[PDB]
């Protein structure tokens, strides 16, 4: 709901059951991703998140309060390379996401590590608190 915008078709790096790190201090060490939100059916195709994708996750390792529940993530760093239309090709050192509520407000206070450009350019609340955008 709190996207304001859309993607530009990057290379998708994170198929289902890709466990990734969580940037936020909410208390999710990891995030086993279940499905991407806004994805159509196709026979034998695993649905695959890139950056700036509203994803369904379970926190697997973290606080006992959070885990063994379904939650909405969003992907921030991808590791797998992708081509911006500018011409530059960019990847990060690690896969990482952050948890959000149903409204599209960020649950944790602040980000550890960098964020991608189109994650900030799309989602305002992740841009509003991040140490560096790239």
């Amino acid at each position: 709901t709190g996207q304001q915008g859309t993607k530009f078709a990057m290379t998708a790096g994170l198929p289902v059951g890709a466990v990734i790190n969580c940037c936020d201090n909410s208390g999710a060490k990891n995030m086993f991703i279940i499905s991407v939100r806004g994805h159509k059916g196709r026979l034998n195709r695993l649905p695959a998140a890139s950056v700036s994708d509203l994803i369904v996750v379970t926190c697997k390792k973290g606080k006992p309060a959070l885990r063994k529940k379904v939650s909405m993530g969003v992907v921030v760093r991808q590791r797998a390379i992708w081509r911006r239309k500018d011409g530059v090709v960019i990847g990060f050192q690690d896969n990482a996401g952050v948890i959000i509520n149903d409204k599209g407000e960020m649950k944790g206070s602040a980000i550890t590590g960098p964020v991608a450009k189109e994650a900030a350019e799309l989602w305002p609340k992740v841009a509003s608190v991040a140490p560096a955008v790239f």
């Binding site: 915008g5 026979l43 239309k85 500018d86 011409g87 350019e121």
Partner: protein, 400 residues
């Protein structure tokens, strides 16, 4: 359902049969409907595919995310030498189809055109073709035939061929009158010209026979057929790959690893009844070398070719030639060219016939501002560090 699952069809059904085309150039199926009125204005034109670069455009789209931002875009570059009109045809309308009402020819004919009517030029002693040189028959005959085209023929098309061009042999120094002259080939090899015919979409028929007779025995250039910002259809034969398996040809899912007699196949050809393999089923055969059209290819810039200022853009104030330093599989490109946006069908060295698009876009990408900041001229073998030779001496002036 009975299939047990739903999944789209593998492969298109409209591009059958997937086999070889023996056309050397892009055979045009259908020309655009004549507006009528206006001017006849030629339509189609041949260009050889020279190679490919990319370019850094600066974009102006209102109400999009790339408003006033740079955008890297691949660009094919077709070389187009200026081609020579020879003949002129009519076509009468009949109940069966369009049937021809005779071709008129020019006064003389260049020996590039004579190559077409032999398979063995090197054997031929006589080399007697187009013996229309006789004075009595040719002069009287054309004015009879040009009268018959006004009477019957509605549609008029202009026969035209590519300039192979002329040169001097080996170590004779050129630009001298005693030296024997001879046909230089293309970047491919060939001296035999690609003859086409080109429909003239100018109203009145009679009006056309002013224009198509004015243009006759004169070279056409690209700058008075296409213009920058035009959407163009590229017609040509694609890239030959020989025989192919069922997996790579139609793009099917291959089987389990545990299969006896291997997994690179479609498993069920068909059902018990009907007792027969269907045309629709995927199967082993030819891949590539297929004749294709493709629609709505933009042309970014049109060339000309000592200043060699063609490669460079408005900015920078440094002049760069279009050929990347080091020239692969082609040649330099010392002719008129076309920076076409994106891919074009076929390999390097292939004759692509261009054509004006049959019906008009209303899409805003069609009527966009082109504005190139800067173009690549780095070598393609393989990673290129220097755009120009000039950069080299400055970067590493002292060597050995």
């Amino acid at each position: 359902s009975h299939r047990k699952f739903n999944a789209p069809r593998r492969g298109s059904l409209g591009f059958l049969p997937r086999g070889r085309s023996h056309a050397v150039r892009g055979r045009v199926r259908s020309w655009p409907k004549d507006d009528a009125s206006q001017k006849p204005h030629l339509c189609a034109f041949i260009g050889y595919k020279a190679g490919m670069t990319h370019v850094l455009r600066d974009v102006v789209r209102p109400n999009s995310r790339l408003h006033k931002k740079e955008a890297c875009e691949p660009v094919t570059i077709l070389e187009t030498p200026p081609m020579f009109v020879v003949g002129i045809i009519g076509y009468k309308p009949t109940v069966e189809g369009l049937k021809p009402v005779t071709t008129v020819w020019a006064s003389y004919v260049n020996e590039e055109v004579k190559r077409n009517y032999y398979k063995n030029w090197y054997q031929s002693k006589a080399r007697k073709a187009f013996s229309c040189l006789s004075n009595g028959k040719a002069a009287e005959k054309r004015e009879k035939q040009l009268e018959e085209l006004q009477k019957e023929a509605t549609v008029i098309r202009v026969i035209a061929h590519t300039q192979s061009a002329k040169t001097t042999t080996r170590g004779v120094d050129a630009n001298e009158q005693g030296a024997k002259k001879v046909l230089k080939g293309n970047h491919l090899g060939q001296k035999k010209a690609h003859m086409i015919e080109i429909q003239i979409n100018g109203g009145d028929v009679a009006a056309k026979l002013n224009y198509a007779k004015s243009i006759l025995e004169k070279e056409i250039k690209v700058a008075d057929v296409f213009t920058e910002g035009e959407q163009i259809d590229t017609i040509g034969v694609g890239k030959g790959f020989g025989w192919e398996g069922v997996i790579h040809r139609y793009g099917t899912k291959r089987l389990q690893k545990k299969t006896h007699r291997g997994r690179r196949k479609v498993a069920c050809i068909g059902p018990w009844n009907p007792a027969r393999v269907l045309w629709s089923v995927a199967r082993y055969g030819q891949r590539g070398c297929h004749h294709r059209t493709e629609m709505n290819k933009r042309i970014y810039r049109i060339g000309a070719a000592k200043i060699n200022e063609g490669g460079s853009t408005s900015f920078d104030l440094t002049k760069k030639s279009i050929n990347p330093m080091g020239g692969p599989h082609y040649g330099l490109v010392k002719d008129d060219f076309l920076m076409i946006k994106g891919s074009v069908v076929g390999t390097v060295k292939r004759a692509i016939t261009l054509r004006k698009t049959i019906n008009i876009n209303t899409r805003r990408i069609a009527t966009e501002e082109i504005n190139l900041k800067w173009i690549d001229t780095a070598s393609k073998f393989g990673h290129g560090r220097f755009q120009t030779k000039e950069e080299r001496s400055k970067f590493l002036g002292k060597l050995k």
